[PDB]
Design a binder for this molecule. Sequence first.
Ligand code: HEM
Ligand code: HEM
Ligand SMILES: CCCCCCCCCCCCO[C@@H]1O[C@H](CO)[C@@H](O[C@H]2O[C@H](CO)[C@@H](O)[C@H](O)[C@H]2O)[C@H](O)[C@H]1O
Ligand SMILES: CC1=NC2=C(CCCC2)C(=O)C1c1ccc(Oc2ccc(OC(F)(F)F)cc2)cc1
Ligand SMILES: CC1=NC2=C(CCCC2)C(=O)C1c1ccc(Oc2ccc(OC(F)(F)F)cc2)cc1
Lengths: 438, 99, 46, 413, 54, 54, 49, 54
Amino acid sequence: ATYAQALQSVPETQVSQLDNGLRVASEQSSQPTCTVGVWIDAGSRYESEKNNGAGYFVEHLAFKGTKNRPGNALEKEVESMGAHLNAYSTREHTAYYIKALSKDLPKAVELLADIVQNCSLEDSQIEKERDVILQELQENDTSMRDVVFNYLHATAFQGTPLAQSVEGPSENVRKLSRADLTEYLSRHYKAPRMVLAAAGGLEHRQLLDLAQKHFSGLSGPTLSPCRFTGSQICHREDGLPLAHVAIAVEGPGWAHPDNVALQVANAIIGHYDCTYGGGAHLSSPLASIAATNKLCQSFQTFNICYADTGLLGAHFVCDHMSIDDMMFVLQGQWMRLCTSATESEVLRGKNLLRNALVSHLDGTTPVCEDIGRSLLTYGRRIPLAEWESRIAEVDARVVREVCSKYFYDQCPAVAGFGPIEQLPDYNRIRSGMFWLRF
Amino acid sequence: RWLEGIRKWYYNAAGFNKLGLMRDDTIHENDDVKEAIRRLPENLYNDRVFRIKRALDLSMRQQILPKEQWTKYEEDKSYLEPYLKEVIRERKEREEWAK
Amino acid sequence: AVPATSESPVLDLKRSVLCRESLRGQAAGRPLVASVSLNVPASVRY
Amino acid sequence: QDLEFTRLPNGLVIASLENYAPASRIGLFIKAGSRYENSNNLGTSHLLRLASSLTTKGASSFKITRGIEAVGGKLSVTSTRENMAYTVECLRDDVDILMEFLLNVTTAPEFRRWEVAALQPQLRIDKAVALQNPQAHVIENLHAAAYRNALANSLYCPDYRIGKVTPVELHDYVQNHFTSARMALIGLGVSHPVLKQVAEQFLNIRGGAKAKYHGGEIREQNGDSLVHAALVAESAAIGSAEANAFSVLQHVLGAGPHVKRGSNATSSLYQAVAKGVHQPFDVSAFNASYSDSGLFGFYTISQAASAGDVIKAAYNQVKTIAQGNLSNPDVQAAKNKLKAGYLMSVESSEGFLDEVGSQALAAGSYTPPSTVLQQIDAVADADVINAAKKFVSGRKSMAASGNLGHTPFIDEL
Amino acid sequence: TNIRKSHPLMKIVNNAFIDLPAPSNISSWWNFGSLLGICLILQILTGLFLAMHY
Amino acid sequence: TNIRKSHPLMKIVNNAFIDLPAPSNISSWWNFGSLLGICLILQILTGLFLAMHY
Amino acid sequence: SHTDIKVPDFSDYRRPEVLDSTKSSKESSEARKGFSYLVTATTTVGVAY
Amino acid sequence: WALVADLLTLTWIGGQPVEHPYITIGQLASVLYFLLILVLMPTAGTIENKLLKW
Ligand code: HEM
Ligand code: HEM
Ligand SMILES: CCCCCCCCCCCCO[C@@H]1O[C@H](CO)[C@@H](O[C@H]2O[C@H](CO)[C@@H](O)[C@H](O)[C@H]2O)[C@H](O)[C@H]1O
Ligand SMILES: CC1=NC2=C(CCCC2)C(=O)C1c1ccc(Oc2ccc(OC(F)(F)F)cc2)cc1
Ligand SMILES: CC1=NC2=C(CCCC2)C(=O)C1c1ccc(Oc2ccc(OC(F)(F)F)cc2)cc1
């Protein structure tokens, strides 16, 4: 029983669509538990300036009652059947999902439907959840990671809806009326912009019929492209003890095949923090150099994907005296992969990526989410055997050519926060995006 | 075996023994030797430190020890070998892996 | 292979809590577990 | 496909489900947790947890890192108070490469003087990071308060020992605890016969007191505006039927959240506390269960001034459960939570491996999920009331961290 | 780390020439130092070439 | 603290000339560096004085 | 909140090619670099002469 | 010391007219110069090593 073989006999994902246009997607295995949820093409990118953070405001109100189950009735019923109810909101994706016993899937699908469609949005509940968000916004100010990434987007996609934070400015949170919320909902929460995903012990046929029963009432706004700008945002705050730097070039966005090769390249460079076992002997040259010279406390490469665009780069957290050196080694890695990546290290990157996405999809929740979001972004679930084919296609030549497209001689977006006196000048950073040899 | 006559002769001709040095004190410090030295236990290191200090002090005076005090050929332990051998063996593994 | 839920720095000021909704989940319910790795960031559990 | 099981004449357990997935997890579980330190070698197991990927006999420090990373793999070491768990993941074709590394790491580590000494500062880094969580302060103190010896040991090396864990101590700890009689080799996506044969040929290694509950209190005064606090009494040993009763009682009282940003309408403790005090807070039932002993109680997170009110309110809630105020719909809901919680915990192939190995050490063999659910149902309402009664009349252990000006003592409660 | 900050000769060049922290706002009147240097080097070369014939 | 280690000019002199750590045992063959310096300075002075007349 | 920070309008300073916020800068990237590097290249040819 | 003595020979030979026996001595000294540096002294080093079990 080989690896190549193993991929061929992984459970297929089923695909059906309702009259209104709601897609129903399912992966089945004999499992006692399941995860089911609703994914929606809705988020901060779809929000204007006047209604920014509405989708986030809604998320707070989603589990706070329905017309059919007022107040804590929705809450009580989830709790008493041992179910676990959860939500998240990205710049492009709002998602509500429930982890339940397999036998309880009918009620699970019913409750999701009740949340989405028949959401109470009570006057007092709005005014309560108003102060809650304001305090979350304050908590978020203390998370330098969150702050620097919000800054990266804000400068990278400046003057567009992608520059906008998911939570919205405090001004909007304090003023958004119930009229705004309900208008936002009926505009964006529509069957063709929605997917019902489920994974665990279930017959696909049953899910589709449960979708009919509760999601039939679901009704049936194009995204403009987003201009990337080579820019810098530098929030200098010497009072904080470590510096956060986030740097990225414009990525290709969800659809593009180059994303696979870019993931391979990002795997080569990889990630590190101070608790990692490897140290000097780590395979990534960036990591081994960073570890031995104590340049940073942590770093990761990322590749964030949006619709027609994205953010491809790295974030690091380091000592106030190490920012210049971190940048130099990081940008040095980008250049080395562009110009001169080797076969064996690309093989390593491939192997990392193969392992990454095979073991991430463990248990029903990550698999349910993969179904939900893949249907939104790609229009289908891409099977593991297809991912493997795209990965095997990547060699040293590919990594070079792909990396040179996005990294080499291109203007990045830089965000820095904290004691950033050392953080290199933009011109020096930009000059660090080429070599005088290749 | 048969060249052991010449090895014993050369040893005394070379004459580091006259300063109370062992052979491994006279090894020129490259990157491997540095690491090998760095890995020595407290006792073996402090002996090395003193033997050299003594030799340097003798060299400073342009004098040698009494003949009784000279390092006997037979008593010259190869103290640095196990550390140095492994330091080298390790680097050659990393150099291999890099290809 | 996959990076952890949280990147860990020493000497870095910690994230604040100002409400009930963010503070729930935190009260420990089971004994500590400790993992260290080669690839994944060290983290402790309830 | 279902699980296979073997216990060799030398004591060692092999358990493996061949499920033909593309990924393969292998775990070597060892009875070598913090509990098996004594007062002379405290924090040794902490260093030992950091110490995989140091040079072994069959592989260098360099080769362990490079070779594993080469195939995109992972090697993790996980410690509880009672066990240590060495886990390897990879794509199925490279299992015997990772296995070779795992065997080297566990059966023949060299613990070289210069490598072991170079690793010493990592104890401070790892500890410092972990102790950023205030739960880590309190739970580590709670145990130290509650016990005289084994389970009192912290998972993290005490400050005074950092820089002072010797190579001898590491060798001794491995030689004395990493033995066939104390080991279970668990696996997924690999055949049982080949695991057995590896365990016979490379894991046949020859062999090498009871936890006294005390009841004490430890108080970290540190001036946070929030006070973390835990109050427990001696519970019941894992494997005993009484333990199941405590697990149900935990879920009656409330054992953490089910809805995002939710107000926990079914949690008995949360509502009991929320009745009196409305400012930011969190409360949960705490249930640890071990081979020798157990701790059951609750953990509060409250404002400094309100700590007295929150703890007393929570304690009062357990008292009324002990007095008999407890209906079937509560005990049914609690069971549904625990039943769901267990099956959800073995939902991932990571957590499943952990439960297979975990059971294999503390008990003889594998109990299937269906049998576990039946045993949860076997807990009667009366058993839950007894668990609560035991807690109320039991000798107490407490731990707190924060500005404790209004945090009561045990004897103030 | 780079070989601009490391190498004993490049170190002096890197600190006094490249990574030198300079005020953002210095005017044209700050150019005259550099120009004095150019003048001096210009005189030395032209001068040396003249001295081959004088 | 002293003004041999402090003053920017004296600092170079103090480190490369006075407090320079030198091996205890260096022989007469180590004098030739200093002597080469003296030679060079000797040539420059005598040379310059000759060039006033040549 | 830090969410109150939004980047100032740089329209005055931008090149015409990157003014349109609903279009991708990547079309014009090939061109914009070409112009600026031509200036540098021309300069070097002149200095060389 | 052979290499030094050879250099002293080359200095003597350099001062002589181009005739017998100064041509042949000169050739033989020049051969020995490069032979000493490129072959003999490197070989001698490695022989010394193998005499010390190195
Ligand atoms: C600060 C640097 C120097 C200054 C300000 C300087 C200035 C002058 C001036 C004003 C003259 C007379 C020019 C004329 O009326 O023809 C002159 C002549 C000369 N200088 Fe210099 N000089 C400098 C450096 C040098 C050096 C370094 C050399 C040779 C190595 C040199 C060699 C000569 C010679 C040979 C002449 C005579 C040829 C002539 O008249 O142009 N000078 N210098
Ligand atoms: C490494 C440094 C120097 C060396 C090795 C050197 C060597 C010589 C030698 C071998 C001669 C011929 C001496 C003779 O047979 O009369 C000479 C002549 C001369 N040198 Fe130098 N020299 C040096 C530096 C200087 C400097 C710095 C100057 C002027 C600033 C200078 C000016 C002269 C002059 C004017 C003569 C002709 C007068 C004479 O023949 O003595 N030299 N030099
Ligand atoms: C009979 C017993 C002989 C033993 C004693 C030797 C000395 C007696 C003289 C015999 C001849 C010696 O040989 C002498 O060598 C030199 C150098 O090669 C010659 O020099 C000649 O040969 C060399 C060969 O490379 C040429 O480059 C050179 O242009 C030429 O001048 C002399 O012309 C010759 O006379
Ligand atoms: C070394 C320098 N320092 C500073 C400023 C202004 C801003 C801050 C300080 C400068 O313009 C500056 C400088 C000085 C000289 C420059 O060209 C040279 C010209 C001559 C030269 O030779 C020498 F040594 F001066 F004789 C060396 C360099 C180039 C730059
Ligand atoms: C600078 C020096 N360093 C060292 C040793 C031996 C021991 C250790 C290193 C020295 O004798 C030494 C030294 C070198 C030169 C000395 O006299 C000078 C002679 C000439 C001189 O001018 C210049 F720059 F060399 F051209 C500067 C100094 C005096 C001392």
